[PDB]
């Protein structure tokens, strides 16, 4: 286990399919699980938002078209999660 980026490319891995699955219909398990994991390891929000751009990025190439300007919703729906987790833990 060398380092960082062994988490982080998990993360990113988890993230895509939660972009993937989430104009679809069950979805809140894997957010819960991202959140939780996020939270858990202390990663920075520029970090979480740099995993959605590199993302949209991927996608925009494989579809042949970085704002996928639908997805803003997956962000701030991730943020907000992750807002409460920080803000429930506080006192």
């Given at each position: 286990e060398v380092d960082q980026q062994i988490l982080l490319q998990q993360l990113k891995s988890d993230y895509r399919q939660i972009l993937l699955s989430?104009?679809?219909?069950?979805l809140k398990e894997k957010i819960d699980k991202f959140i939780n994991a996020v939270f858990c390891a202390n990663i920075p929000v520029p970090e979480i938002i740099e995993i959605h751009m590199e993302l949209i990025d991927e996608f925009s190439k494989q579809l042949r078209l970085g704002d996928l300007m639908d997805y803003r919703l997956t962000l701030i729906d991730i943020l907000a999660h992750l807002c409460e987790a920080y803000r429930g833990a506080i006192f």
């Open positions: 989430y104009f679809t219909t069950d």
